Amino acid sequence: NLNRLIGQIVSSITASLRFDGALNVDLTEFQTNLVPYPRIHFPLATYAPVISAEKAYHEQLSVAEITNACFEPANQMVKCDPRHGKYMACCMLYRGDVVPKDVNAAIATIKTKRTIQFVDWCPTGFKVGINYQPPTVVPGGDLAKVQRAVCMLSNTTAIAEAWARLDHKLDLMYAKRAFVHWYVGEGMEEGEFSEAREDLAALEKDYEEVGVD
Amino acid sequence: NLNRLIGQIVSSITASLRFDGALNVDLTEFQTNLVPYPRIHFPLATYAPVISAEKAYHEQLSVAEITNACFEPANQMVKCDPRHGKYMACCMLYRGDVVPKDVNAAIATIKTKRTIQFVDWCPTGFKVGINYQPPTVVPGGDLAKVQRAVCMLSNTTAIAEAWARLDHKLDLMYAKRAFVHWYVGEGMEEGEFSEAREDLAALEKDYEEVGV
Amino acid sequence: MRECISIHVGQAGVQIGNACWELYCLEHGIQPDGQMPDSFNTFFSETGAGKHVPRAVFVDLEPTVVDEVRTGTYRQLFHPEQLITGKEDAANNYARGHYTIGKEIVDLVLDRIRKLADLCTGLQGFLIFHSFGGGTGSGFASLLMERLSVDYGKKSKLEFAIYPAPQVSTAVVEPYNSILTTHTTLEHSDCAFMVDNEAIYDICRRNLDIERPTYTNLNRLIGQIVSSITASLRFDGALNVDLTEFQTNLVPYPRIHFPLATYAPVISAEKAYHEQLSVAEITNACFEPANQMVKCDPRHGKYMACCMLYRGDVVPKDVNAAIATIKTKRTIQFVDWCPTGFKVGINYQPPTVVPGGDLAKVQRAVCMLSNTTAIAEAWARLDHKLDLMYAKRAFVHWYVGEGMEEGEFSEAREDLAALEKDYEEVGVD
Amino acid sequence: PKDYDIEGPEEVKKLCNSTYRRLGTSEPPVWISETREKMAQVCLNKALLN
Amino acid sequence: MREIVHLQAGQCGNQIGAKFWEVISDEHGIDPTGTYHGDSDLQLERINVYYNEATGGKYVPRAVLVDLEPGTMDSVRSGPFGQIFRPDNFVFGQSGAGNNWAKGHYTEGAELVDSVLDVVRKEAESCDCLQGFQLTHSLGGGTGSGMGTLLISKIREEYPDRIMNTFSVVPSPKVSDTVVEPYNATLSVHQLVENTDETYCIDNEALYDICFRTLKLTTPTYGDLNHLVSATMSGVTTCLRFPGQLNADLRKLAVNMVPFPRLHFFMPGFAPLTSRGSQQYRALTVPELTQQMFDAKNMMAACDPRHGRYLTVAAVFRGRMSMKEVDEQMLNVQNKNSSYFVEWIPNNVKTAVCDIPPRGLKMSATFIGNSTAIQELFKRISEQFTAMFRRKAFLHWYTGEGMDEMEFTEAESNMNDLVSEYQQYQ
Amino acid sequence: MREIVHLQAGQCGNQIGAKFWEVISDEHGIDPTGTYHGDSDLQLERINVYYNEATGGKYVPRAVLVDLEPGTMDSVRSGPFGQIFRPDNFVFGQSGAGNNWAKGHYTEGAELVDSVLDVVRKEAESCDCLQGFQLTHSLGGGTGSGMGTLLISKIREEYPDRIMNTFSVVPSPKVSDTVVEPYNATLSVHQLVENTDETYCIDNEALYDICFRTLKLTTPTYGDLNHLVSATMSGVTTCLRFPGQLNADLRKLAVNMVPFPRLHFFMPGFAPLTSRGSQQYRALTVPELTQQMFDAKNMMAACDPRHGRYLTVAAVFRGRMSMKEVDEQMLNVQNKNSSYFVEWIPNNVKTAVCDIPPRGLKMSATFIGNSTAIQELFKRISEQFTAMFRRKAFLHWYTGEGMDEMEFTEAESNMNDLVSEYQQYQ
Ligand SMILES: Nc1nc2c(ncn2[C@@H]2O[C@H](COP(=O)(O)OP(=O)(O)OP(=O)(O)O)[C@@H](O)[C@H]2O)c(=O)[nH]1
Ligand SMILES: Nc1nc2c(ncn2[C@@H]2O[C@H](COP(=O)(O)OP(=O)(O)O)[C@@H](O)[C@H]2O)c(=O)[nH]1
Ligand SMILES: Nc1nc2c(ncn2[C@@H]2O[C@H](COP(=O)(O)OP(=O)(O)O)[C@@H](O)[C@H]2O)c(=O)[nH]1
Ligand SMILES: [Mg+2]
């Protein structure tokens, strides 16, 4: 059931290479629009119209209703709150029966929010992709047959909390040399853990330095 | 087999003196390129490309990987962690058919990484030297035929923790004057070990002083 | 493949082995002829026509008891040459049967035992039956121990001995025969189960409801206990024990080898079938002072090692639950350096019934061999009676006339004073 | 619903056997993994004028 | 696919693994005569893990049976599954050990290992790919404690990188079946710690209380306890034989349980254990396996885990079940009673899910637990050993076989180092 | 066409040859009256290797039975298969050799060798193309050793190009059943090195060890050993009578296994030897055969291959197999153990495959092997001979027949140079 949503977002990323659309998006486009530096290449993935097969037709699933669902912290597919940091780059890939004017209106609606904060050095912020092909349903699945969808690829500095937790976890584990004797004993020396801790600390304070106003 | 590659390193030391090349290194040349202080002269040797006789027909190693093989911690011939000390002076003795540009490209790629830590007062850091002769192949030797070999000799701060345990090893045996009666029995002052301990503590202090 | 060779010496040995081999024929399919109309290979050899020959030697110096069995019901059961007789008995004299009568018999008995042991695949040990108070069982068996230790060595030598009773006795010079027998049984026997005739009189009067018992009523109980000891050698069980198993589980030191035997259900046909008796009944019956078969009280001494052998319909969970009551009870005291205490063995086969016997047919039983400090009191009493005789030099000229020396009694008194000191020092904190 | 009684009226008793030959009687009808069950679901499934 | 060798030593080894092979042949659909009668194709596919295919379509188990006495050999051949074993894997002695570790390790247990080693090498040269070895034995005997430890040492010398397992029967706290049991438990544990990768301590009174408390049996047989033991023995090789959503072999379980090389003593447990008359009324749901798999009385070692701290936890799940309420319950059992889990490792529980249950159950769960409450066993063993050693009790039966007192002192000191190291995390 | 003239000598020779003819008539499908009652067609294509064509579908064997007393071949004649033998082939004598090499070689054997040579010429002119001869006898006997050595030395001269084999029964290492047999064996194997180009050594105690440990037979008679002898005796000529993917004649096994003209003593073995109770448990694959061909227990001579070096090893395979699992196994033996193979011959193994298995067996294989560990048989016979010749323990039974002491001296000398030549190549 998790792999169904993973396949749905992966298909929605690669949908523009196969089906005609008003705004084609290549695979080499994401690296040129989502990372500002090679040290920061960890964006989040979000699928907005995730809804069951029985209550997908009592709801008006317009572009405005589906775009603002991507920015809700409870609809994200990484357990980190975007209010911890601020957004650096966003990539929206719409699908199905979607007009571009309502996409423009919905994206302009997000910019008026004060609960969603962008970094200062990215005054533009957004990337728009529109494809004609609606999401195809699978037999015996969980999602319903919806006429439009969007997937969000957003790079944020709020992921630095996750790196902080992972590094605190390693420091809590490596402080008294647990499980190391089955790492060094198979083609390794002792100093690789210090290298990884080195680079991860560099990553954390790179993340702290990027979000400086 | 222990001593033959040491002989190969010392032959690469004199390689710039017996034949021609591009950048020749005199014996008095590295006499100032490596030792930075009137007291700190203990460089560390490193011979990166060494493979067996069966693993030569498949892969040929270029400059950008051999230079990276010079700076990996499982090559240098003193068992000290080199990440615990900043590099101070390096010399790379390139041999064989080496063009000079990929050496500067390798130097730049070594410069940008964070594993190889340098001191602030040595922005130059490295000294390069290129010959026109590969190493010879010896009868019954274990080494393989490498067209482009590199001998690396470099000072390091990490050698401070090498003899820092030798000092404690002398301490453990000087607490009750062990084995000194074959020493002071043959015309040595029993206090002479103290005026080597204070000298070694001075050496540790100078290594710490050039650490900051 | 699990054979042991039983040796019976003297009148007590033959008259105990007769009951023992009645039980062995009865609980196997073996008729007194020997025909049967890991089970039977251990105690019975095979003749290809279908006959079974027991692996036993019957030794005595007078001919009466052993030549009686050649003219009885079991005449065809035993091999003719495996019954050894002599002309003159030892006449209640250790010196005669150890020096001048046992000298010219042992070269035949050792030859017969070696001929028995060459037909065996894997030998487990020897069972020796004799009596301390006699002249045959005290002298000739004792010499046989070293004579077979020399050429066999590390094999097990279990001892079944009729210890002299404290109050009753059937002779005058029995302190002498009981005292110098222990010179060789201490350095040669691995373990010596002791049973007192007075205590079996008390059991046959008390537990079973008969007065005036004969010797066969005693040999029946002794044979039941003996078959319960070697039950695991022949019959399959959940927890099999060996002849070598209780030689390492009952003796902590090589000089103290004297456990006490006890059979729990001793009940007649009139009384057995009005009550249940499964595990806690018989296990609680084994550890009582009344059912002890040597007239010394374990309440006096300290328990050192107990070996509990279960037989019949028995589940190990109830065995543990019954050992719970024993371990929790404060009137039963173990020595401080044996926190473990017990060795258990569970057998499938129920005890067999004996037509002409006195024990009832019950589904299950337990036999206990427990090494205790409390036998040191019997040693002290018997040594008292010996040096009561020896100071006046009563009944000494017969011993010194039959190839002994006067000082051999001094060595024996010294050795058993040392043994009493050993029993004292073992039981101290 | 035992499969061996050792407290029964029978005489020869074997102690190494089990009272129950398996634990429980709730076996599923057909054994199938999650992946092959959930990947077999693809084999399961005018006007008056034209 | 990778195949596993089974070693059996003495009465414990022979009986426990006889029940083990019976229940494996039940689960893999093999009859007493060795022929396949099962229906599912998953039953036959990974049968190379435990069985070798013979001609004619029948399968022989990969087991070696040893003992110093020939009685238990004919006892195990006459069982219901005695005809399934290969006759050449019956390697027996002519005279026993008699509860003596010394003559089971040096005197009589030494000259026969030169045939068990030949049998094991012969079977393992036809081995396609050797994962590891299994061995069930007893620490309170002369065969399993002595010859078993000798076999472990002489296999670790020959095959160094393969995983060694041991399902040992530790001595009971209250009933000692042997007076000389501490003299064998100590000298076997001292050899186990330098020669095994995984060792499971199984007690007998713990099994009695588990069977009476859960199965509601007032009088179980030995076969029932062996069934309970082998249910865990089969519960750790599920992912090697059946498909699963989250696989874990014995090596992967060893990696995620032992933090230090000398910490490989666990206490196992089984989750679904209910009476027949209360198993049609109970709905076997995912929370109800966790609720009693982690109960303090669902342990086959006689140590209370609430008196210690859980270093690492392994939970191997069998059957059709979702992955949300597995992880949710494993998180909930850690977040509430955090006083029983060490805090210098964040996750204590390792989760593996297999998709095929044991026969008769819909879903199941096997437990392996690393606890610092296992020092309550060796403290008692060392206490009894030092009470029995200062008096030279039964020592002449050991020193006369080729021993010395210094071996006893160096074994007791090793176990005291073990108990001193365990107390550092509590 | 390549046909073989069979020869006999002595009581051992007749008793082995009876079972050999029985099993080869079973293999070719001949009922004991002589006619053909088979089911296939390949059993009649090459029947002229061992049989002549009489009148009316009756086949007579190509054998001659030789003895110096008539009491031994009467038991052959009145046996089960004694009627197929032609009565003119029976050559008997009045007085026996009396366990005397001198009497069987110089006095009694030389008065009978003209008749046997006449029968051999009678038999060998029916050959359109004769390949060679074959003899079975024993060296510890009188007429076996002496008469066979005289026959070999006489028919080598007149038939120089042909291949002559001997399935001799070399004497006992442990318990000899002839006291004088050192002398007979010493005078016999000194004959055998100069005339036979192929010789197989059969040890009765090796056969005893096989039928006890491997075949699990309690009371084996001499027929139960002659079956084993003829199983590997008939497995050599299997490529002359049946097709195959890779053939091996007698000359192909003589060229590839005799590097020097003296070292032609091989030790045979038969691969699929299973007990009746363990036959079902064992799969039949080429690894299962090649594990047992190279095993030391399977060897039919009482010398251990761990005491020497395999000079050259032959392996003739029978049945429908794949040339994978024989080629990789012959590589695997050379690569696995290497101290037991001489380094100056890189490829030490000869391989052949015939596709018609023996009757009742899916697959079979025979071993033929030249090893320098055979010198410990010659050293033992030499020391037992010089312990008797030094003070002439039985020399009066030999000197009265016209033999001198220098015959024994030169027989001992030819033993010593053979032992030295086996040693210098190890
Ligand atoms: N329980 C029991 N004790 C016996 C039996 N026969 C003899 N005894 C004991 O043996 C003692 C008598 O000495 P014996 O053992 O008979 O002496 P012996 O074996 O005949 O040797 P000699 O007297 O020299 O002929 C008595 O005190 C009895 O306690 C018996 O059948 N049952
Ligand atoms: N749970 C269980 N315990 C057993 C079994 N068989 C034996 N035991 C235990 O093992 C101990 C005795 O083992 P032992 O006979 O000394 O093994 P040995 O070394 O071969 O002699 C006793 O405490 C028994 O409780 C069995 O099948 N199941
Ligand atoms: N291996 C084996 N040896 C046999 C057989 N028959 C006889 N022998 C051996 O032949 C030897 C005696 O042969 P013998 O009768 O003296 O031969 P002959 O007198 O020359 O005819 C003895 O050592 C026996 O071991 C047999 O069937 N198999
Ligand atoms: Mg008498």
Chain D residue whose CA is closest to A138: D42
Contact F155, F124 (CB under 8 A): no
User: Which residue ranges make up each domain of chain C?
Assistant: 3-250, 260-376
Give the C-alpha separation, E131 to E116, whole Å.
19
Task: Please tell me the experimental approach by which this structure was elucidated.
Answer: cryo-EM
CA distances from F141 to F102, F174, F200, F355 (A): 11, 17, 17, 39
Nearest to C265 by CA among C282, C279, C278: C282
Contact E270, E213 (CB under 8 A): no
Full set of structural domains in chain F with CATH? 3-257 (3.40.50.1440), 265-374 (3.30.1330.20), 375-425 (1.10.287.600)
Contact E97, E104 (CB under 8 A): yes
At F356, give phi and psi (nearest 5°). Answer: -110, 105
Three-state DSSP at A111 gives helix
Task: Could you please state the CATH topology (level 3) that the domain comprising C3-250 is classified under.
Answer: Rossmann fold (3.40.50)
Residue type at F64?
Answer: V
B178: CB partners within 8 A, 6+ apart: none
**Residue C239: which H helix or E strand, with range?**
none
Q: Which atom of ligand 1 is nearest to the CA of C131?
A: 15
Give the C-alpha separation, F365 to F315, whole Å.
7
A139, two tokens = 């037999």
Q: Nearest C-alpha to atom 18 of ligand 3 is from which residue? A: F141
**Residue C209: which H helix or E strand, with range?**
none
Give DSSP secondary structure letters for D8-43: SS-S---SSS-SSSSS-S---SS---HHHHHTSTTT
Contact A61, A49 (CB under 8 A): yes
Q: Tell me which chain D residues have a C-beta less than 8 angstroms from the C-beta of A138.
A: 41-42
Q: Nearest C-alpha to atom 12 of ligand 1 is from which residue? A: C134
Report the relative pairing of strands F59-61 and F63-64 from DSSP bridges: unpaired
| C348 in D contact zone (CB under 8 Å) | yes
E119: CB partners within 8 A, 6+ apart: E64, E88, E89, E91
| E259 in A contact zone (CB under 8 Å) | yes
Three-state DSSP at B88 gives strand
Give the C-alpha separation, C426 to C419, whole Å.
11
| E67 in C contact zone (CB under 8 Å) | no
Give DSSP secondary structure letters for A51-107: --SSSSSSS---HHHHHHHHTSGGG-SSS--GGGS-EEEEEEEEEES--HHHHHHHH
F413, two tokens = 């000398």
Tell if the CB–CB gap between A179 and E255 is shorter than 8 Å: yes
At A92, give phi and psi (nearest 5°). Answer: -105, 130
Residue type at C280?
Answer: A
Resolution of the coordinates in A?
3.6
CA distances from B135 to B10, B75, B131 (A): 11, 19, 11
Compute the nearest-CA separation of E56 from chain F (Å): 8
Give the C-alpha separation, E308 to E311, whole Å.
9
Nearest to E296 by CA among E369, E200, E204, E394: E369
Mutation choice for ligand 3 from F204, F226, F230, F233, CB with most ligand atoms inside 8 A: F204
Contact F97, F103 (CB under 8 A): yes
- Cα-Cα end-to-end distance for chain B: 40
Q: Tell me which chain E residues have a C-beta less than 8 angstroms from the C-beta of C124.
A: 95
F99 lines ligand 3 (CB under 6 A): yes
Written in H, E and C, the secondary structure of chain E is CCEEEEEEEHHHHHHHHHHHHHHHHHHCCECCCCEECCCCCHHHHCHHHCEEECHHHEEEECEEEEECCCHHHHHHHCCCCHHHCCHHHEEECCCCCCCCHHHHHHHCCCCCHHHHHHHHHHHHHCCCCEEEEEEEEECCCCHHHHHHHHHHHHHHHHCCCCEEEEEEECCCCCCCCCCCHHHHHHHHHHHHCCCCCEEEEECCHHHHHHHHHCCCCCCCCHHHHHHHHHHHHHHCCCCCCCCCCECCCHHHHHHCCCCCCCCCEEEEEECCCCCHHHCCCCCCCHHHHHHHHCCCCCCCCCCCHHHCCEEEEEEEEEECCCCHHHHHHHHHHHHCCHHHECCCCCCCEEEEEECCCCCCCCEEEEEEEEECCCHHHHHHHHHHHHHHHCCCCCCHHHHCCCCCHHHHHHHHHHHHHHHHHHHHHC
Q: Nearest C-alpha to atom 25 of ligand 1 is from which residue? A: C89
Three-state DSSP at C124 gives strand
The catalytic site residues of A sit at 29
Of A191, A199, A202, the CB nearest to B83: A191
Instruction: Give residue E13 CA to ligand 2 midpoint distance, Å.
Output: 8
Of E255, E344, E346, the CB nearest to A182: E255
CATH number of this structure's domain C260-376: 3.30.1330.20
CA distances from E138 to A200, C306, E9, E178, F133 (A): 50, 21, 8, 12, 64
Instruction: Give residue B128 CA to ligand 1 midpoint distance, Å.
Output: 109
E16 lines ligand 2 (CB under 6 A): yes
Give the C-alpha separation, C371 to C382, whole Å.
19
CA distances from C178 to C163, C281, C369, C416 (A): 8, 36, 22, 11
Q: Tell me which chain D residues have a C-beta less than 8 angstroms from the C-beta of C346.
A: 15
The answer to the question of whether E100 is labelled as a binding residue is no
Q: Tell me which chain F residues have a C-beta less than 8 angstroms from the C-beta of E55.
A: 280, 282-284, 362
Residue type at E410?
Answer: E
Contact F235, F300 (CB under 8 A): no
Written in H, E and C, the secondary structure of chain F is CCEEEEEECHHHHHHHHHHHHHHHHHHHCECCCCEECCCCCCCCCCHHHCEEECCCCEEEECEECECCCCCCHHHHHCCCCCCCCCHHHCECCCCCCCCCHHHHHHHCCCCCHHHHHHHHHHHHCCCCCEEEEEEECECCCCHHHHHHHHHHHHHHHHCCCCEEEEEEECCCCCCCCCCCHHHHHHHHHHHHCCCCCEEEEECHHHHHHHHHHHCCCCCCCHHHHHHHHHHHHHCCCHHHHCCCCECCCHHHHHHCCCCCCCCCEECCEECCCCCCCCCCCCCCCHHHHHHHHCCCCCCCCCCCHHHCCEEEEEEEEECCCCCHHHHHHHHHHHHHCCCCECCCCCCCEEEEEECCCCCCCCCEEEEEEEEHHHHHHHHHHHHHHHHHHCCCCCCHHHHCCCCCHHHHHHHHHHHHHHHHHHHHCC
B31, two tokens = 């006499």
Give the C-alpha separation, A112 to A102, whole Å.
16
Chain A residue whose CA is closest to B115: A195
Instruction: Give residue E218 CA to ligand 3 midpoint distance, Å.
Output: 69
CA distances from C245 to A40, B184, C222, E179 (A): 74, 66, 21, 11
Q: Tell me which chain D residues have a C-beta less than 8 angstroms from the C-beta of A139.
A: 41-42, 44-45
Q: What angle do CA B187, B193, B199 make, to 5 degrees?
A: 130
Contact E110, E116 (CB under 8 A): no
* CATH 3.30.1330.20 applies to domain B44-160: yes
Give the C-alpha separation, E36 to C78, whole Å.
53
Give the C-alpha separation, E408 to B16, whole Å.
66
Q: What angle do CA C4, C10, C13 make, to 5 degrees?
A: 45
C185 lines ligand 1 (CB under 6 A): no
E226 lines ligand 2 (CB under 6 A): yes
Q: Nearest C-alpha to atom 15 of ligand 3 is from which residue? A: F11
Give the C-alpha separation, E426 to E376, whole Å.
13
Tell if the CB–CB gap between A176 and E261 is shorter than 8 Å: no
C288: CB partners within 8 A, 6+ apart: none
Length of chain B measured in residues: 212
User: Out of C198, C245, C281, C408, which one is annotated catalytic?
Assistant: C245
Nearest to F354 by CA among F313, F326, F312: F326
Nearest to F200 by CA among F209, F211, F214, F189: F189
Tell if the CB–CB gap between A139 and D38 is shorter than 8 Å: no
Give the C-alpha separation, E404 to F362, whole Å.
57
